TrEMBL record, chains C, E:
Species whose genome carries this gene: Gallus gallus
CC cofactor note: Binds 1 heme c group covalently per subunit.
Protein's UniProt name: Cytochrome c
Domain called Cytochrome c: residue spans: 24-176
Subunit note: Component of the ubiquinol-cytochrome c oxidoreductase (cytochrome b-c1 complex, complex III, CIII), a multisubunit enzyme composed of 11 subunits. The complex is composed of 3 respiratory subunits cytochrome b, cytochrome c1 and Rieske protein UQCRFS1, 2 core protein subunits UQCRC1/QCR1 and UQCRC2/QCR2, and 6 low-molecular weight protein subunits UQCRH/QCR6, UQCRB/QCR7, UQCRQ/QCR8, UQCR10/QCR9, UQCR11/QCR10 and subunit 9, the cleavage product of Rieske protein UQCRFS1.
Automatic annotation (TrEMBL), chain D:
Quaternary structure and partners: Component of the ubiquinol-cytochrome c oxidoreductase (cytochrome b-c1 complex, complex III, CIII), a multisubunit enzyme composed of 11 subunits. The complex is composed of 3 respiratory subunits cytochrome b, cytochrome c1 and Rieske protein UQCRFS1, 2 core protein subunits UQCRC1/QCR1 and UQCRC2/QCR2, and 6 low-molecular weight protein subunits UQCRH/QCR6, UQCRB/QCR7, UQCRQ/QCR8, UQCR10/QCR9, UQCR11/QCR10 and subunit 9, the cleavage product of Rieske protein UQCRFS1.
Family: Belongs to the UQCRQ/QCR8 family.
Record localization: Mitochondrion inner membrane
Protein role: Component of the ubiquinol-cytochrome c oxidoreductase, a multisubunit transmembrane complex that is part of the mitochondrial electron transport chain which drives oxidative phosphorylation. The complex plays an important role in the uptake of multiple carbon sources present in different host niches.
DNA-binding recorded as keyword: no
Keyword vocabulary terms for this entry: Electron transport, Membrane, Mitochondrion, Mitochondrion inner membrane, Respiratory chain, Transmembrane, Transmembrane helix, Transport
CC annotations in GO: mitochondrial inner membrane; respiratory chain complex III
Any single biological process term in GO: mitochondrial electron transport, ubiquinol to cytochrome c
Protein name, per record: Cytochrome b-c1 complex subunit 8
Protein's membrane topology: Single-pass membrane protein
Classification via Pfam families: UcrQ
Length: 147, 379, 241, 80, 241, 380
């Protein structure tokens, strides 16, 4: 009896159903065409899902893994080259980037510069790291489930 | 000292009140309610905090925050049930606790008795303000009906009331202060309870035969620790059976409707445990008299210690007092019933009779029959 | 205006203390609501995700929510906009506010049904009797324009025109949509909307009782075992006398 | 009961005056101040030092921080 | 990069611990806000009634509020609608939501001014310096399109074009509306909007100090009076030696 | 029963044996005035706290404004708000002087009184921490975010404990509502444990500045200390009110006059002055896990003091070496406080690690060492 009552009370304090209901989001890759970045709302913060062309994925390999503050090649970030999914928040002081613009064709944080490439890596600017890459995966050649 | 249960400045306290504490060998089940009341209190505070962590005191979110708690929080519905129904278990236990003391002259322990009356008044205030929080129809109207009674106090009437409301009617500033009060009072109850037991330990417990039990005392543990634990599960069964098989048996369906200041419910009546007082309230047609009669319905308890005439403590060996006692108990069921009925004939007259006999029995008959019985014992 | 008819007690399959809801009936009752009642009645506290694992599949639920356009926003320019529903959305409100609701129902206000079976004495027995109890006013009684006679409604003049009639819809599970069949199902659904915990609550009641029976017996024996010492105790007065 | 069980004391006499027969703050210049000075003196070189040392460290570190913000001309002397 | 210019300390007439606000200056400052800043800046926490007995008459306040149309509702049909302002209304928001605000200011967001002098280090000294400190960027520095150079703003590139210039408005009290006169007044006003209690708070500080001075001396004497018994106490060791 | 009712009565008897006829050392100094100030401080926080609670709304969408409404509309709401917010600092100033005194006079040799005291301090910190979140300003939210995330660094049960505490995935509304509940609750636990604190204390009675038995010279608490403490109350209460009335925001972060915004990190996330020293120690250890432990240890270290006493004398009154070591420590703490308010950059980073390192050295190594050394210099 005790074990149960204690368990129920303890769990009353963990995430409620309405909260879990927003735990993870599933995006349809079919809605996102190449050369065009799309942003969805996940956990109150912007979620970036860009369809990288075989063209952009190339600009990516041409990156000195050892010439970036947060040294990581596309290899370590994505899963399916044609797909880049980032947390739309600058690593500097929390602002939300602007896609396509910037010195490296990726994203530009209008707060203090912070330029991110097509892979979302800090290039020029105050930001320390590169836009975060949240957990996820794919389901069918048209659905991705971030979170 | 040899054993650390006596030397230590803290255990020593736990020992002299729950282990080596001298208890009468013959106390019955009516003595199980103090501990249940204590456990009852720890449980309300516990389930109360768990609910408070999801509640929002704002007229625009109260109702739904409670709904959100029941619908989304893990076991929110269970906690809400237990807290709500726990309030009744609390009162059931408290009325039996009070009864026991009236029937066995425990009130001759004046301080223990008076702190006890204070505990009851605080418990009521707590339940009253707690009831408003969900902000349903009976929540708001109950608040409205009762708080308006006091504008009837001459002079400081409208003042005291408008001060309490924090405005011109029961509104948001009332809700927020009631939440603060509802969170606060239980802690005052816990504190005063310590005093209650402190005065009690001055004398020790009274027993059913009302004679000195110094000749036969037993340690609280294991006799009463076991007796009380048993008494806990025996009561806890009907409690849970109600909260799990008939969650809304005691509640007003009117409270599943968001409060609406422009729609008076047809029957504004309290929870069962207040009905008897609500009856006495309406018995006196005249705003001021009714309020006083209401107040007195509970404050009357402070006079009991002064109306004891018997030469014997309990009513165990007093047959005339015994029936008068059960008349009283029946009197209260009648008032409870009247309180839940509309204000119409025959209920109106029955109400005034029961209200009138209520005070007669306590103020006039009990002390009178007591004296009478003294003569019949040739004393 | 005085005198009221009290509904009877129907033998619902979820009335027993140990008897759950017939989820098949609940699923149908949802359809009734969705296709009939949801036209005027809001149900603010239920969301499509709530159906999953109760009456519908996760796919069915996701589909049902997408049939709805919800207002999201603001966007980049601070504009509101529409979007298809997610299972996290709650059942759509038929009107923006009660003023509009009344405006469209002859100043009458169809209440939210989320807690209706608990907000009314009688519960589902009441709602069922009301839905199937419409009839003509007795002699001496006149119902004002816009109101309909229902003996089960207090005052007998209700602002809701009989909402259901035979075959007013088709149960896609192949059940004969008679008027009473419909009311029966929708009421079962409403019981569920008022308290989704219902079944779990009862399952818990079973465990509570068994453990309660077990634990109380056990503790009675222990209490008795310890007290046996005083219960059987014998004493004697032996003065020097 | 804590008064009467404290200590075993013998042969000590004490004399005291009612508060109304005496002054509240007597001999401010002949006794009070001198002592205040005495007390200050006896402690200053025990308390002050580490606080003075803290101050210095604070000043250095604050200035050293602002200095590193200025520009060193020796980085642009051949930027023609 | 980490370089920043700090504003100087101006001798505001309300800087003294015992010195109140110049209500004449506050009244003017309100005009500036109303006629200049209120175009982009919201001031959510102040209502017209707040001006009464501070800078304006009750009539003036009632007039000022009526110049505004506020959205009330819903009505009988559940419709929103306009109405003239009452003194219970708060100063009007220039935009519905921040998205719209940014939309109209090059993605920049002019903050609510209700607590600005406290939400910024430097307070009114900062806001004054900023308003009167616009100038051209020094060599080597380029301000991106849409931004204006202000040495007092962190990063020196601000999204607010110089808001005030000489005679940009006329003080109906006949005061020479030079640019610095304006900034001085609006800053004073902002000080008041952040803390209306300002004057009362200081008046209270005066009473607190006097009573504090009085009560402390008194209690010092009493403490001393009682202890005098132990302070002057004398003892001696008299063994039967 | 007994002659006077001040001894017989089951309640007055308690009031008498702790505030009137209670035996007090005749020579206790002003450093002994902080206990009563702490008690009064507590009654005042609870009081102003309840008055503010009656107008507060724990919801992300109404918190910030409910507090503004209180300041702007409630009669003297601004005053109460000031007193409560500034009272928190008065509370900590008093507690650090209370702790100091005990360290310098070896009061900690009263182990239980000392340990319940450390518990009072921990509870007081948790209270102030969760209370700080209630206005839901920028530092409210970011402080909550920074600090609570530290624990996701605990091995295995990390992320779990944190997400449990938050009631979700980030500091959000379900965190605020439970923090309000906690903030309302803890102060009462503080009041309760305080009773225990004084109960253990009365077992021995007060220690005194010379650290030798004062049984030969004890005086009744009243009127000597009832007056001394009341005087001590007004002496402190003056600087308090002077601050709360003439410089209301001197100690507060301007960043908190801006509603919390999850998408805008403030440039300098730093605590209230009374937490700075710990924040410094936190950042001294680059490594999420080590820093958290280092943080925890910065306060838990207080539970070890009773075990590191080597001196043959109780106080440091007659221990010159220990006295300077004591003031080094105090200076050490001002430095950490200062470092805690500075950005994480050179020279602050190195200075930070030096002060954090010397902090623990002084308490764990030097104090017990110098103590022994001094025993030898007394020919003991
Ligand atoms: C007050 C609010 C009103 C709410 C409704 C009141 C509750 C009504 C429930 C009915 C009570 C059920 C208890 C019935 C038990 C019957 C029973 O056992 O009685 C006989 C038995 C015989 O005892 P002895 O003479 O000592 O025997 C020894 C020698 N062999 O009597 C007793 O147990 C003692 C009576 C104590 C219980 C009283 C409980 C009644 C409760 C109501 C509250 C009344 C007091 C006034 C409160 C004002 C506020
Ligand atoms: C911790 C958080 C950090 C916050 C900042 C710390 C606060 C810094 C403020 C400085 C303290 C001001 C007090 C200066 C008073 C100077 C003074 O009078 O010192 C001399 C005097 C001489 O005493 P005796 O030898 O007994 O004399 C008898 C024979 N004639 O010494 C004393 O009064 C005893 C010292 C007690 C006060 C110590 C207060 C320092 C407070 C800081 C907290 C330190 C402890 C560690 C806490 C960890 C958490
Ligand atoms: C055209 C809109 C409409 C439809 C469709 C409708 N109702 Fe209603 N309903 C109303 C109105 C209007 C009222 C208000 C009656 C009144 O208060 O006079 C109402 C009231 C109610 C009430 C009882 C109110 C009370 O005070 O007892 C219930 C229960 C109810 N409806 C159930 C249903 C159910 C179930 C359905 C679908 C089977 C349904 N309604 C469909 C309009 C409708
Ligand atoms: C055209 C709209 C507009 C006008 C008119 C205007 N402002 Fe602003 N103000 C802004 C914008 C845009 C910002 C945002 C600046 C940024 O963050 O880059 C701003 C920002 C501010 C800030 C400083 C923000 C900070 O972070 O320090 C203050 C203070 C301010 N305005 C004061 C005023 C005052 C006083 C006036 C009236 C004299 C005024 N503004 C008039 C647009 C305006
Ligand atoms: C929160 C409510 C209360 C708590 C927690 C409490 C607790 C207790 C406890 C634990 C005891 C000892 C066991 C027992 O005799 O049942 C006790 C005894 C007693 N209480 Fe209460 N009590 C409460 C309210 C009251 C009230 C309302 C009254 C009467 C107005 C009261 C009158 C007494 C008296 C007189 C005794 C003596 C019992 C005897 O005759 O031996 N108590 N109470
Ligand atoms: C002496 C103990 C207590 C009593 C008698 C009591 C009684 C009540 C009552 C009568 C209600 C209304 C029940 C209903 O919803 O119908 C209520 C609600 C509530 N109580 Fe208590 N309560 C107690 C202690 C507490 C405490 C200590 C807290 C937490 C600090 C608390 C928090 C709440 C909350 C949040 C609600 C509103 C949510 C709800 O209605 O379920 N209560 N209480
Ligand atoms: C809410 C906080 C606290 C309250 C209300 C409190 C209150 C008191 C009071 C009234 C006394 C007697 C007067 C005095 O000697 O100053 C006392 C003594 C003492 N307290 Fe605290 N205290 C608190 C926190 C602490 C803390 C944090 C410590 C240390 C970790 C502590 C350690 C002691 C000790 C050891 C004594 C003995 C004093 C002596 O040497 O005679 N207390 N406290
Ligand atoms: C140990 C005593 C307490 C401490 C150390 C304390 C500390 C704090 C602190 C640091 C704040 C934030 C101040 C600010 O706005 O900057 C705060 C806010 C608050 N406290 Fe307390 N508090 C205490 C007791 C209480 C109690 C008992 C209540 C009432 C049940 C309470 C209710 C509140 C409320 C409503 C706020 C939010 C409003 C505001 O920000 O001023 N506090 N408290
Ligand atoms: C806010 O209304 C709360 C009610 C309630 O029952 O809470 C448990 C309530 C609901 C409907 C109508 C009235 C209500 O309140 C009350 C309150 C009440 O209080 C007293 C009880 C005994 C003695 C004096 C009073 C008073 N005043 N006596 C009867 N009903
Ligand atoms: C919610 O954040 C509250 C803060 C606060 O200072 O409240 C008074 C706060 C603000 C900004 C940054 C951090 C903040 O919180 C804290 C909390 C904190 O807590 C401790 C203090 C001593 C020892 C261990 C801990 C921990 N954990 N130590 C330092 N800062
Ligand atoms: O009564 C009892 O009296 C004891 C003696 O004062 C206390 O120690 C206990 O805590 C209290 O409950
Ligand atoms: C029927 O659904 C129940 O819902 C509960 C939600 O509280 C879960 O804990 C149970 O495991 C689940 O069976
Ligand atoms: C008197 C003691 C009563 C204790 C009863 C314990 C029964 C609680 O049992 C509960 O049953 C639910 C439904 O299967 C589960 O979802 C819960 O996890 C489980 O704890
Ligand atoms: C707002 O007015 C205030 O009223 C107070 C009186 O309540 C005065 O003491 C203040 O000086 C005054 O500014
Ligand atoms: C140490 C004790 C200090 C107590 C100081 C009491 C002074 C408070 O005085 C206050 O002054 C305000 C301004 O005139 C008035 O509006 C308030 O009503 C009044 O109470
Ligand atoms: S927050 Fe992105 S550059 Fe600073």
């Amino acid at each position: 009896a005790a074990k149960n009552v204690v368990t129920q009370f303890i769990s009353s304090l963990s995430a409620s159903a309405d909260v879990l209901a927003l735990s993870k989001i599933e995006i349809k890759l079919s809605d996102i065409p190449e050369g065009k970045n799309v942003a969805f709302k996940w956990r109150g913060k912007p979620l970036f899902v860009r369809h990288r062309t075989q063209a952009e994925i190339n600009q990516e390999a041409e990156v000195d893994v050892s010439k970036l503050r947060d040294p990581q090649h596309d290899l370590d970030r994505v899963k399916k080259p044609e797909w880049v999914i980032l947390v739309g928040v600058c690593t500097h002081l929390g602002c939300v980037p602007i896609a396509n613009s910037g010195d490296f064709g990726g994203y530009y944080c209008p707060c203090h510069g912070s330029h991110y490439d097509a892979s979302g890596r800090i290039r020029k600017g105050p930001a320390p790291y590169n836009l975060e890459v949240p957990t996820y995966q794919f389901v069918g050649d048209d659905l991705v489930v971030v979170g | 000292a040899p054993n650390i249960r006596k030397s230590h400045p803290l255990l020593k306290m736990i020992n002299n009140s729950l282990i080596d504490l001298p208890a009468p060998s013959n106390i019955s089940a009516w003595w199980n309610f103090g501990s249940l009341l204590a456990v009852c209190l720890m449980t309300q505070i516990l389930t109360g905090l768990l609910l408070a962590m999801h509640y929002t005191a704002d007229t625009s979110l109260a109702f739904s925050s409670v709904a959100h708690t029941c619908r989304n929080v893990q076991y929110g519905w269970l906690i809400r049930n237990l807290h709500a129904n726990g309030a009744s278990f609390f009162f059931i236990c408290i009325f039996l606790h009070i009864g026991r003391g009236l029937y066995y002259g425990s009130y001759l322990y004046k301080e223990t008795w008076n702190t006890g009356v204070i505990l009851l008044l605080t418990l009521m205030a707590t339940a009253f303000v707690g009831y408003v929080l969900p902000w349903g129809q009976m929540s708001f109207w109950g608040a409205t009906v009762i708080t308006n009674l006091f504008s009837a106090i001459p002079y400081i009437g409208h003042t005291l009331v408008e001060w309490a409301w924090g405005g011109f009617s029961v509104d948001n500033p009332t809700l927020t202060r009631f939440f603060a009060l509802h969170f606060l009072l239980p802690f005052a109850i816990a504190g005063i309870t310590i005093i209650h037991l402190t005065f009690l330990h001055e004398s020790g417990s009274n027993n059913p035969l009302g004679i000195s039990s110094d000749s036969d005392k037993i340690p609280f543990h294991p006799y009463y620790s076991f007796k009380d634990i048993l008494g806990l599960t025996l009561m806890l069964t009907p409690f849970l059976t109600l909260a799990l098989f008939s969650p809304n048996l005691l509640g007003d369906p009117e409270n599943f409707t968001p409060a609406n200041p422009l729609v008076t419910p047809p029957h504004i009546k309290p929870e069962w445990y207040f009905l008897f007082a609500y009856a006495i309230l309406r018995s006196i047609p005249n705003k001021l008299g009714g309020v006083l009669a209401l107040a007195a319905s509970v404050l009357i308890l402070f006079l009991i210690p002064f109306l004891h005439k018997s030469k014997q403590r309990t009513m165990t060996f007093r047959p005339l007092s015994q029936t008068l006692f059960w008349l009283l108990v029946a009197n209260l069921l009648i008032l409870t019933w009247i309180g839940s009925q509309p204000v119409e004939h025959p209920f109106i007259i029955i109400g005034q009779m029961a209200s009138l006999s209520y005070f007669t029995i306590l103020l006039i008959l009990f002390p009178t029959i007591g004296t009478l019985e003294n003569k019949m014992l040739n004393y | 205006g005085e005198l009221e008819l009290h509904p009877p007690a129907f033998p619902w399959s979820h009335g027993g203390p140990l008897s759950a809801l017939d989820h098949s009936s609940v699923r149908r009752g949802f359809q009734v609501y969705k296709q009939v009642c949801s036209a005027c009645h809001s149900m603010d506290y239920v969301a499509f995700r709530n159906l999953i694992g109760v009456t519908h599949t996760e796919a069915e639920a996701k589909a049902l929510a997408e049939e709805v356009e919800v207002q999201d926003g603001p966007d980049e320019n601070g504009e509101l906009f529409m979007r298809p529903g997610k299972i996290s959305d709650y059942f759509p409100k038929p009107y923006p506010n009660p003023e509009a609701a009344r405006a469209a129902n002859n100043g009458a206000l169809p209440p939210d049904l989320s807690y209706i079976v608990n907000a009314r004495h009688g519960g589902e027995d009441y709602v069922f009797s009301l839905l199937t109890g419409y009839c003509d006013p007795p002699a001496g009684v006149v119902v004002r324009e816009g109101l309909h006679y229902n003996p089960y409604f207090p005052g007998q003049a209700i602002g809701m025109a009989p909402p259901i009639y035979n075959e007013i819809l088709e149960y896609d599970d192949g059940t004969p949509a008679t008027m009473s069949q419909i009311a029966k199902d929708v009421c079962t659904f409403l019981r569920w909307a008022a308290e989704p915990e219902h079944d779990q609550r009862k399952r818990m009641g079973l465990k509570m009782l068994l453990i309660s029976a077990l634990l109380t017996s056990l503790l009675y024996y222990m209490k008795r075992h310890k007290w046996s010492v005083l219960k059987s105790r014998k004493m004697a007065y032996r003065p020097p006398k | 009961i804590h008064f009467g069980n404290l200590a075993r004391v013998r042969h000590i006499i004490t004399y005291s005056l009612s508060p109304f027969e005496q002054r509240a703050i007597p001999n401010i210049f002949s006794d009070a101040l001198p002592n205040v000075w005495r007390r200050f003196s006896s402690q200053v070189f025990k308390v002050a030092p580490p606080f003075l040392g803290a101050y210095l460290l604070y000043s250095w570190g604050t200035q050293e921080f602002e200095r590193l913000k200025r520009k060193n001309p020796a980085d642009y002397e051949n930027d023609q």
